[PDB]
Design a protein around this ligand. Structure first.
Ligand SMILES: [Cl-]
Ligand SMILES: [Cl-]
Ligand SMILES: [Cl-]
Ligand SMILES: [Cl-]
Ligand SMILES: [Cl-]
Ligand SMILES: [Cl-]
Ligand SMILES: [Cl-]
Ligand SMILES: [Cl-]
Ligand SMILES: [Cl-]
Ligand SMILES: [Cl-]
Ligand SMILES: [Cl-]
Ligand SMILES: [Cl-]
Lengths: 15, 101
């Protein structure tokens, strides 16, 4: 189950 | 285009067309570092928002006017902007992308 921090990374990070 | 490809791959368009989404082209650690940068007010009244000292590389993805699930369609806009994030937790890390400036 994805955490809020997890969801931010998935949605927004593209290093 | 990048927005259609990355929106799909990141599970933002598999089960809906998310109207707006921003992707940041910086390391995870450098984005996390924002949570100890400049404390600013949040739009929602909270004060756990932080603005990056620096401009960051970001891609804005915005649904077109005609776009409709399942055939989601995005406009792609690339920019270097300050980011504003809401932070929370232990560790105190970004949980919401608020704005780009
Ligand atoms: Cl959580
Ligand atoms: Cl999602
Ligand atoms: Cl939808
Ligand atoms: Cl939606
Ligand atoms: Cl966004
Ligand atoms: Cl990274
Ligand atoms: Cl805000
Ligand atoms: Cl306001
Ligand atoms: Cl608060
Ligand atoms: Cl925007
Ligand atoms: Cl720019
Ligand atoms: Cl929050």
């Amino acid at each position: 189950k994805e955490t809020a921090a997890s969801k931010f990374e998935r949605q927004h990070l593209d290093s | 285009n990048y927005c259609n490809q990355m929106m799909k791959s990141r599970n933002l368009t598999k089960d809906r067309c998310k109207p707006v989404n921003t992707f940041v082209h910086e390391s995870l650690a450098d984005v996390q570092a924002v949570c100890s940068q400049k404390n600013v007010a949040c739009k929602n009244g909270q004060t756990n928002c932080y603005q990056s000292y620096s401009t960051m590389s970001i891609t804005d993805c915005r649904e077109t006017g005609s776009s409709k699930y399942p055939n989601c369609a995005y406009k792609t806009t690339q920019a270097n902007k300050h980011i504003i994030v809401a932070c929370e937790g232990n560790p105190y890390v970004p949980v919401h992308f608020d704005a780009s400036v």
